[PDB]
Design a protein around this nucleic acid. Structure first.
Lengths: 99, 79, 1351
DNA sequence: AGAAATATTAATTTCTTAATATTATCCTAAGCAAGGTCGTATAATGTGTGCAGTCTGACGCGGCG
DNA sequence: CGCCGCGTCAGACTCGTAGGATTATACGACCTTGCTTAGGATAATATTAAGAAATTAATATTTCT
């Protein structure tokens, strides 16, 4: 099985097909530990934002690849600020202390 | 080089710093479009960056000084 | 966009209104025929935004042009549809209700703030009894419960003068009415006056909560919800499935209840209902909100039509399935495939096969861009058409785009960082990934169905990382130990062993060859056998001073095969590396020598060449396995029958009554084990050497060429145990309770088992199989806990400039030197200057990296104790330094700054465990080698028998050598006869101490008389008087084995002379009275005086069972959790003199009085403890008083930090080393560092008296305050040891803490604390999708640090 | 004669207005099916979750002597 | 001082993965609402004059060639 791009789930906005092109490979916690061990921060960052959740990021970086420019413009994963909304709906004021 | 990057590591002294410098130079050669300092030899820009760092042709100070030289010359071309 | 920190507080109702875009007023979701969002409903388009991009509902304003406008017909705003996912609503609750998280938490925060028992709050909230909000009358006080009839009465006397209410209105009034400054100051002033410990801790809770609410900016009222926020609809979707049915997130149902009930309440207050009905409605409203916020924590969980419980809000951000663990730390990933793996034996170490179809699908956008660039497709739309049609130019473009593009291969479970390695693809025609054989061992991958995931690094930094950090040719040294992990595994090792072997007389026996090349020519020509002894000239090279290879040639006496193999060996290595049998150990060690002498590149090339030549010559052999290769010893039948006759004889000795049942068992199990070992010896003698070979006509036995023996001997596959089960009898099995089945399986696999023998075998088979199944989960949990403790530890400096650290010595447990100094010191950095046996002769200016050269240099001399900088003793604050760590084991040099050592250590410790979790007489001191003697921790006197008495239990015997290197350490029991003394030149094979294996004696140190006092007959013994010689049945036992009759009977024997008064131990005035220990037999009755050194009380010991020590995984888990060790070995808390006090109130009193110090300090110790200390004796701090496992907390508190870290390192090491698993000590040291992270304050002048603190904060304060800011207004600390799970939960960052355990509790605490975290740990930055401050992200994140410096 | 430059009819865009006829909003009145609420007087007056299989081990902690 | 017994909550990890929870259920009658006919008045709006003039593309001299 293989996948470059396809379906994306509804709530979390993260890879999950299955009909023809199946969902992407899960990159679990243990593999995050392995990349943290190697010291590879950029591979990790792209496997969190632009390969999985960062919507503007995922499409912008597909465009960048097609152009022949291999560069990443990462934002914030969808699952994080979905979490922010879910914590906020428990009447708990969690925010992001901007600069 | 292609198989082992030991020589680049001894030339910079840090795996992580080597990755950062090589990525900066490869970005220069891929998007910035400037010509390599070693022969192409049918390699991807990443490997040319590593090969250049192997020969001591590219060090973080060298990248800084070339960038500053070109920027100051452009600012001179402003006037 | 960029933010810096994340702040949690409590949501003021005005703030919940501020978030909201409109009030939800109805429980209506969508229409049933139009399926369009209804006004004011849960999905309203006015509130939560439009349903389609730039369209109102009524379609009046329906294009981009009219963006931003609010269509007056329908109220919708013309904007993107994504804002259904970001806009929130709010339900205006018609009666305040309690937030369940801040009420039903284990430490209720409403109940602490108010100081009202949770039961009383539950009674008020459930509308069950009133409470006095405030009373002008004096008889009624605030927070005083008034039951219904009691309320009626109280209303009768006064009425308006007192305000009493019911429910959350009352509780909100109470919270709103208290003043935080006043209770703060009152509690502070009355904490000191009556400082009872339980009261002190309760008041500490109260106070800290009150300053939390004063400083955080929160207010207490906000605990009670009056406006309830509503999640955006896209996060609780109601979406149509294929069949026409819809699918809804459970929150909708939960939300519906609230609104329904809320609406009913809004109606009842208008109809002026009987207040019983209004009360019930408010109860149900509270229950519905509670089920919304946390269904579980709510006593009864609301279930839907499925009848399984609904999933509340708190159930989505919590657990393994929550957002944190499942969608925020580990995600599904694009550009990733997976497939079955197979061997590519033609590959090179940096290469992986990759199916053409899989690579085409993974690299698709790259191909699109390249096709557009070449002009082959000036259209992306037609490029897709070309890729789908699979033109023959697509394949050329693919081979062009895949060159130099590394791809990460992964195999789950990823136990350690070498489980995800970046290869460089080679396109192959197939559907199975092809893996290089040498890299299987790191993956734990075998080819019987395993599957590997393929990930494509997209960006350019990711490509350089996968090439420079992960590339398979960089990872040839393990990060746990330094040993290589490119070990030639099993077929290659049998090939090397078959080629580098020899024979007595074979083709080409003793001819001379001009080099290796014509050795190969002779073998290929068929003129000489692969292994036939021969003289070959070879020219080996050697790296002399200045790293120059000097060529020296000679005429070696080798075989043909070894000469052939020398051609693949790199220049710089000796021929000795090839002139041997070359099993697995030899091959791995020659790879080690190649790495150490030459470097990484020659080692990679050498590993590939070894693989190719091993595979090639293994195939040339014809190595098979026939049923005749397993030879039963021709003398196995007689051994079996001999054991049969012996068990028959012992049966006849059991029937005759001569032996007992338990004794028959051990004896018969012993004779079966003996017969088993004899059969094992017989087979291994019939295998290993049975080959008789002709030499000049005469026989000459050599090592065998049996297929199975070679496969066992080379180390390829199997061991003597498996061979034993194949040919010899397969030993004794165990019943499912551990009981070794009496009779053993006497058959083997060449003859096949019986029905019963097979059935018995099955018990152990399933035991082991289920154990393996259930052992992985425990190891996974241990690894997870370790990682979450050690996450944020990264090398952060070059040199903290620290003073000395740990003191490093070989672990010699008796005869066995468990671990030597070279393996305990290699790579570390010296704590300070080290001197040779000639004093003041130095090799190190206080710190130098001890690599192989220095280790050999210090093995030239006899140094056996080196001071080493260790992580536990680093001065660096928010991490460690590059020296106090040592050597980066995988890279083999000093460790790079900014590496994540915490994760490395956690994975190094947790990776094993998955693979190995898990007579006894002890006669006397049988010294095994010649050397001197040194005695430790004993202060005795020379006896009248010519030997030395034994004053104490801590008699440490230390065997030394003629070179000053201790080789044996023993502990002789207190009162065990010792033959020789100190300083003697003692040769081995002798016993220096004396005691029977079933004798742990205690000796009179002078001539002793027996006085019948306190061994009083009737209350602890029964008098059975015997003759004048001094016999009896008297048994004296320790306190743990004293009956209830003997309260004033102290078990002892007062040693007095023939004069009658107390004779003295030589050197004391305190009367000689050895309170004899447990399991002790004493025979002397009144009228008996024995020698000065003749025993009173011997303690028999048999050590039956041989399984009485915990081990395996639970032992390591227990060590790291730092749990309480059942009954603990009590220590001596303060140095001084101890005496006794009040007798057996249940516990004796031990009063410790220093020569000059805190004299009135005492302790209470139960009647289960035999005191090594006497009635009154002078002891030093941190000394054993009672015996048992040591609680590590005490070890840290009394002995030094180095002491507790040594204890933990040694214990967990012993557990590993027992299983043949080696893990360098730095990993356990760093985890121990992360345990010792908090301190409890002693003094004051800077902060509070004792409350928990981070020791780095305290050290920074003392580095700021007790510097020239103040002489000493600072505060000292008591260093605290903390279990891994507790320490990982006592993190200063609430996102890391909330991520993995007790999410609800951590988040509730952070809310009432008004906390904020600044995103410094790796986990925090993984969550918010940033660059971790380790490795490559370090340079980035320090930029942010410097920009934080300048605003 | 074979182009090679010229004068004529002649076939032809290009605006332009008006125009001219067609056609398509629009908008409000009205109408019809659908959706929401009330109103019922023999008498009727307390409960179902219909259970639940001791996980689990510390551990918090509230007691608890 | 030293338990001691109540709840209580997360227990490692990658792949696919069919069927899924009954009970028992009234008629009018306004009243409103949400969508459909419908009927001309204009209003665009596509086309038609028209001519006139302007090229402009051919026709037919006649002069070179």
């Amino acid at each position: 099985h293989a996948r470059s791009t396809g379906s994306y789930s509804l709530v979390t906005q993260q890879p999950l097909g299955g009909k023809a092109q199946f969902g992407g490979q899960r990159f679990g916690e243990m593999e995050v530990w392995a990349l943290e061990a190697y010291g590879a921060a950029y591979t990790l960052q792209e496997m969190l934002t632009v390969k999985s959740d960062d919507v503007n990021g995922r499409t912008k970086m597909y465009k960048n690849i097609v152009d022949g420019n291999h560069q990443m413009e990462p934002g914030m994963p969808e699952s994080f600020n979905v979490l922010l909304k879910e914590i906020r709906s428990l009447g708990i004021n969690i925010e992001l202390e901007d600069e | 080089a292609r198989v082992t990057v030991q020589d680049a590591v001894e030339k910079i002294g840090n795996r992580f710093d080597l990755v950062l410098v090589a990525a900066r130079r490869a970005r220069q050669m891929q998007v910035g479009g400037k010509d390599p300092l070693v022969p192409e030899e049918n390699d991807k820009t990443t490997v040319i960056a590593l090969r250049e760092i192997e020969e001591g042709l590219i060090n973080n100070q060298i990248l800084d000084v070339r960038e500053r030289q070109e920027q100051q010359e452009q600012e001179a071309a402003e006037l | 966009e960029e933010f810096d920190a994340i702040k949690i507080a409590l949501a003021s109702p005005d703030m919940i209104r501020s978030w909201s875009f409109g009030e939800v007023k109805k429980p209506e979701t969508i229409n049933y025929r139009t399926f369009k969002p209804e006004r004011d409903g849960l999905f309203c388009a006015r509130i939560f935004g439009p349903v389609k991009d730039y369209e109102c509902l009524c379609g009046k304003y329906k294009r981009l042009k009219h963006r931003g406008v609010i269509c007056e017909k329908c109220g919708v705003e013309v904007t993107q549809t994504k804002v259904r996912r970001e806009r929130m609503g709010h339900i205006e609750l018609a009666s305040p209700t309690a937030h369940i998280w801040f009420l039903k938490s284990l430490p209720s925060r409403i109940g602490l703030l108010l100081d009202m028992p949770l039961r009383d709050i539950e009674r008020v909230l459930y509308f069950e009894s009133y409470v006095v909000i405030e009373g002008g009358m004096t008889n009624l006080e605030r927070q005083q419960i008034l039951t219904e009839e009691q309320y009626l009465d109280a209303l009768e006397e006064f009425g308006d003068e007192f305000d009493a209410k019911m429910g959350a209105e009352a509780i909100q009034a109470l919270l709103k009415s208290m003043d935080l400054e006043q209770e703060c100051e009152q509690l502070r002033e009355e904490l000191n006056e009556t400082n009872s410990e339980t009261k002190r801790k309760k008041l500490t809770k109260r106070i800290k909560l009150l300053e939390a609410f004063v400083q955080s900016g929160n207010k207490p009222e906000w605990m009670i919800l009056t406006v309830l926020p509503v999640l955006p609809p896209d996060l609780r979707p109601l979406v149509p499935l294929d069949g026409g049915r819809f699918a809804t997130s459970d929150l909708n149902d939960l939300y519906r209840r609230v609104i329904n009930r809320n609406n009913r309440l809004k109606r009842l207050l208008d109809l002026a209902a009987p207040d019983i009905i209004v009360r019930n409605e408010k109860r149900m409203l509270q229950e519905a909100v509670d089920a919304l916020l946390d269904n579980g924590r709510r006593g009864r969980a609301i279930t839907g039509s499925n009848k399984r419980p609904l999933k509340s809000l708190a159930d989505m951000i919590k657990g393994k399935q929550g957002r944190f663990r499942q969608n925020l730390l580990g995600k599904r990933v694009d550009y990733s495939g997976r497939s079955v793996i197979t061997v590519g034996p033609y590959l090179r170490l940096h290469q992986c096969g990759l199916p053409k179809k899989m690579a085409l699908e993974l690299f698709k956008p790259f191909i699109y861009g390249k096709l557009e660039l070449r002009g082959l497709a000036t259209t992306i739309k037609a490029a897709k058409k070309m890729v789908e049609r699979e033109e023959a130019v697509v394949w050329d473009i693919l081979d062009e785009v895949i060159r130099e593009h590394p791809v990460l291969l992964n195999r789950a479970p990823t136990l350690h960082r070498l489980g995800i390695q970046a290869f460089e693809p080679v396109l192959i025609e197939g559907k199975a990934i092809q893996l290089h054989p040498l890299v299987c061992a790191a993956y734990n991958a075998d080819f019987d169905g395993d599957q590997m995931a393929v990930h494509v690094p997209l960006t350019l930094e990711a490509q350089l990382e996968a090439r420079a950090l992960m590339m398979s040719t960089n990872n040839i040294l393990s990060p746990a130990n330094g040993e290589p992990i490119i070990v030639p595994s099993q077929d290659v090792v049998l090939g090397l062993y078959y080629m580098t072997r020899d024979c007595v007389n074979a083709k080409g026996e003793g001819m001379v060859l001009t080099g290796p090349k014509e050795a190969e020519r002779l073998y290929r020509s068929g003129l000489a056998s692969l292994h036939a002894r021969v003289k070959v000239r070879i020219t080996e090279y050697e790296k002399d001073a200045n790293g120059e290879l000097v060529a020296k040639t000679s005429l070696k006496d080798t075989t043909v095969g070894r000469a052939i193999l020398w051609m693949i060996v790199p220049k710089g290595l000796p021929y000795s590396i090839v002139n041997q049998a070359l099993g697995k150990k030899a091959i791995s060690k020659m790879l080690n020598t190649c790495y150490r002498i030459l470097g990484l590149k020659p080692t990679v090339i050498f590993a590939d060449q070894i693989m190719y030549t091993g595979f090639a010559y293994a195939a040339r052999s014809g190595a098979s396995v026939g049923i005749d290769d397993m030879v039963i010893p021709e003398k196995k039948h007689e051994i079996i029958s001999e054991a049969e006759a012996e068990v028959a004889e012992i049966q006849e000795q059991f029937q005759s009554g001569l032996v007992t049942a338990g004794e028959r068992y051990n004896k018969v199990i012993d004779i079966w084990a003996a017969a088993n070992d004899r059969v094992s010896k017989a087979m291994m003698d019939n295998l290993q050497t049975e080959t008789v070979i002709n030499r000049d006509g005469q026989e000459e036995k050599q090592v065998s060429f049996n297929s199975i023996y070679m496969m066992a001997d080379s180390g390829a596959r199997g061991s003597a145990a498996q061979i034993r089960q194949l040919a010899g009898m397969r030993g004794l099995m165990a019943k499912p309770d551990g009981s070794i089945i009496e009779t053993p399986i006497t058959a083997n696999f060449r003859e096949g088992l019986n029905v019963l023998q097979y059935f018995i075998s099955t018990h152990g088979a399933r035991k082991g199989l289920a154990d393996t199944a259930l052992k992985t989960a425990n190891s996974g949990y241990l690894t997870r806990r370790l990682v979450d403790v050690a996450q944020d530890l990264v090398v952060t400096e070059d040199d903290c400039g620290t003073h000395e650290g740990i003191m490093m010595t070989p672990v010699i447990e008796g005869g066995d030197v468990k671990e030597p100094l070279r393996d305990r010191v290699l790579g570390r950095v010296t704590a300070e200057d080290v001197l040779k046996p000639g004093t003041a002769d130095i090799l190190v200016p206080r710190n130098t990296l001890l690599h192989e050269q220095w280790c050999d240099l210090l093995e030239e001399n006899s140094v056996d104790a080196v001071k080493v900088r260790s992580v536990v003793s680093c001065d660096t604050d928010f991490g460690v330094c590059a020296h106090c760590y040592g050597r980066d084991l995988a890279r083999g040099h000093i460790i790079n700054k900014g590496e994540a050592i915490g994760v490395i250590a956690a994975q190094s410790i947790g990776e094993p465990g998955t693979q190995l979790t898990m007579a006894a007489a002890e006669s006397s001191i049988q010294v095994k080698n010649k050397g001197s003697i040194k005695l430790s921790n004993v202060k005795s006197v020379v006896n009248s028998s010519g030997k030395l008495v034994i004053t104490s239990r801590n008699t440490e015997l230390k065997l030394i050598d003629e070179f000053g290197r201790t080789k044996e350490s023993y502990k002789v029991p207190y009162g065990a006869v010792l033959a020789k003394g100190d300083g003697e030149q003692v040769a081995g094979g002798e016993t220096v101490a004396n005691w029977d294996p079933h004798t742990m004696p205690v000796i009179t140190e002078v001539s002793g008389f027996v006085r019948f006092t306190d061994m009083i007959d009737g209350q602890t013994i029964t008098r059975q008087t015997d003759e004048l010689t001094g016999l009896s049945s008297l048994v004296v036992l320790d306190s743990a084995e004293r009956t209830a009759g003997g309260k004033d009977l102290r078990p002892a024997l007062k040693i007095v002379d023939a004069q009658g008064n107390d004779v003295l131990i030589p050197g004391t005035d305190m009367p000689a009275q050895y309170f004899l220990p447990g399991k002790a037999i004493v025979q002397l009755e009144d009228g008996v005086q024995i020698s000065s050194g003749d025993t009173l009380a011997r303690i028999p010991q048999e050590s039956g069972g041989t399984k009485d020590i915990t081990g395996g995984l639970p032992r390591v888990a227990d060590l790291f959790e730092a749990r309480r060790p059942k009954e603990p070995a009590i220590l001596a808390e303060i140095s001084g003199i101890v005496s006794f006090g009040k007798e057996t109130k249940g516990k004796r009193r031990l009063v410790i009085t220093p020569v000059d110090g805190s004299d009135p300090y005492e302790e209470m110790i139960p009647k289960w403890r035999q005191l090594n200390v006497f009635e009154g004796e002078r002891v030093e701090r941190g000394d054993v008083i009672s015996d048992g496992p040591e609680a590590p907390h005490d070890i840290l508190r009394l002995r030094g930090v180095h002491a507790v870290t040594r204890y933990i390192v040694n214990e967990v090491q012993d557990v590993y080393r027992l299983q043949g698993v080696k893990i360098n000590d730095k990993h356990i040291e760093v985890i121990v560092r992360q345990m010792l992270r908090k301190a409890t304050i002693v003094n004051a002048g800077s902060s509070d008296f004792l409350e928990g603190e981070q020791v780095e904060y305290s050290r920074v304060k003392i580095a700021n305050r007790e510097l020239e800011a103040n002489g000493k207004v600072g505060a000292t600390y008591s260093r605290d040891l903390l279990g891994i799970t507790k320490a990982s939960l006592a993190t200063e960052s609430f996102i890391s803490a909330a991520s993995f355990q007790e999410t609800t509790r951590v988040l509730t605490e952070a809310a009432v604390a008004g906390k904020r975290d600044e995103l410094r740990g790796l986990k925090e930055n993984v969550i918010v999708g940033r660059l971790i401050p380790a490795g490559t992200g370090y340079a980035y994140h320090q930029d942010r640090m410097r920009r934080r410096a300048a605003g």
